[PDB]
């Protein structure tokens, strides 16, 4: 097994257990956005079967993230179970998904962590204002893991895709001026990741009613403008299509990004659409304000 | 509340939780007697209501002590509950007792801890040999607590007295040549601690049948000789009398040191008798081999 994974599981278990003893108030204080809990474990000639002997686990702003979970309709006991009852599964930036497919666990940089801290309060207030109804990533936990030498940072989000319904096609859309296209090595996977021109070449249509579309684009408008005002760019719309005829009703309380196709759709389809990859990443590298309108226009045209 | 007490409770809770994930083998390995687990917690602007912000908890030889609990008929979940569901109560060396009166928690020195480590394996093997039937202290856990500056060591033992039945009179007997007597300041308490000459002056009798006496003294003989061979001295026989007429059947599976009075006893009495205070303590200060026979003779005469 992966020792970083077992520290993550141990840590989330420890985190949620600790919070079960902490009183939940309705409001956050400015200090909650600067808070953390740190635990350092040293086992000498003990418990080698389960845990590395020397590890650290640090949770950033535990009260804020608990408040976010609640606002996103997520119970702490359930969150704990999803992350701990069985190991998260790998995919290959690399990521894991909880065994029940409800949550995504992504390894991030210390720079991403700094950026998340920078936006956390404004992010929180935005979620308050929209009552948790948003196409933004739903940030549920943020941690630092140390296992004798190696140090990693992780963030946990709600899965954009369904926890039951399988996805047969997936798009990552930015709407950029610079040409975007998938590679053939990716094509060879069971579920590849297609891009802008794949969509605007294979004549992909999304069959949703005018009401669903209006609601979606209203939501997208606000989300994107919030991202713009934080000077964030290079995020994508993730789009996943579930084909009912191959594998089809979903729970909107769990698969919160799902939209049914309208009645005249050529095939029985369910769409899963959300914004992803919102943090900067100074390892990769035209302005944020331009990026947003450009992103908003493209999604307008394709839908 | 007492922050050292809440670290103890947190630590025992954490300890038992961790062990619930560790496989129980039938046997201990030599390394289990050198093992420990260390956890250091640092909370910044978080969880001030329950815990100090900076503390450490260290458990010595967790596998050995788990094995001892099992051998003493104690379930880990029950032990955990007894120590954590409500705070232990103070008494004033000073000690606490678990809320349900099942366990004693005593603060000890780093010297006592060194001595316990020194005897732990031999102690364990002795308990194996007698199948847990002994008048020795039943050692159940040993810990180190740190709360920002202060460092303390604690050991947990089974209560010599009953967890239901009240005790109206208590003796601490060593059988020493040097005169031993209680003080008047102690007398003024609801339940004082009387000594050798109080017994051998107030004409105290213990009314148990010849079978119970023989069994007791056989047990005492072996226990004391084991203590002698470890070069330990200055331990006492603790004696507590429960008066049924004032407050009377006990569970021998819980109140393991209880002995009913015989049928011709002037009053309905239950006795609780065990050895206590077996470690050296180099702060207090004629040889161990002499001490034992001298202790064994006195208990022979008074019973
Ligand atoms: C965290 C950052 C960001 C973000 O901000 N949010 C909010 C977010 C939210 N949700 C997701 N979900 C997924 C994104 C992408 C995929 C995918 O294409 N995965 C492929 C690779 C592995 C492939 N494997 C799976 C097991 N298969 C074995 C089968 C036989 C049993 C064999 C084939 C399946 C297809 C799947 C997702 O769900 C599992 N991603 C997010 N991102 C992503 C950029 C990582
Ligand atoms: C750990 C070291 C060693 C050892 O090795 N083993 C194995 C061991 C095992 N068991 C005990 N038990 C007790 C020893 C002694 C006493 C006592 O005289 N206590 C007095 C002081 C407090 C008094 N308070 C109680 C609350 N009261 C309030 C009432 C109104 C509600 C008011 C009066 C009650 C009488 C009580 C014990 O049980 C609670 N002691 C041990 N020792 C002792 C030397 C500490």
Curated annotation (Swiss-Prot), chains A, B:
Predominant subcellular localization, coarse grouping: membrane
Keyword Transmembrane: no
Catalyzed reactions per annotation: a 1,2-diacyl-sn-glycero-3-phospho-(1D-myo-inositol-5-phosphate) + ATP = a 1,2-diacyl-sn-glycero-3-phospho-(1D-myo-inositol-4,5-bisphosphate) + ADP + H(+); 1,2-dihexadecanoyl-sn-glycero-3-phospho-(1D-myo-inositol-5-phosphate) + ATP = 1,2-dihexadecanoyl-sn-glycero-3-phospho-(1D-myo-inositol-4,5-bisphosphate) + ADP + H(+); 1,2-dihexadecanoyl-sn-glycero-3-phospho-(1D-myo-inositol-5-phosphate) + GTP = 1,2-dihexadecanoyl-sn-glycero-3-phospho-(1D-myo-inositol-4,5-bisphosphate) + GDP + H(+)
Any one Gene Ontology molecular-function term assigned to this protein's record: 1-phosphatidylinositol-5-phosphate 4-kinase activity
Gene: PIP4K2A
InterPro entries named among the record's database cross-references: PInositol-4-P-4/5-kinase_C_sf (IPR027483), PInositol-4-P-4/5-kinase_core (IPR002498), PInositol-4-P-5-kinase_N (IPR027484), PInositol-4/5-P-5/4-kinase (IPR023610)
The protein, known as: Phosphatidylinositol 5-phosphate 4-kinase type-2 alpha
Modification note: Phosphorylated in tyrosines. Phosphorylation is induced by light and increases kinase activity.
Domain PIPK: 1-303
GO BP term (any one): positive regulation of autophagosome assembly
Subcellular location field: Cell membrane; Nucleus; Lysosome; Cytoplasm
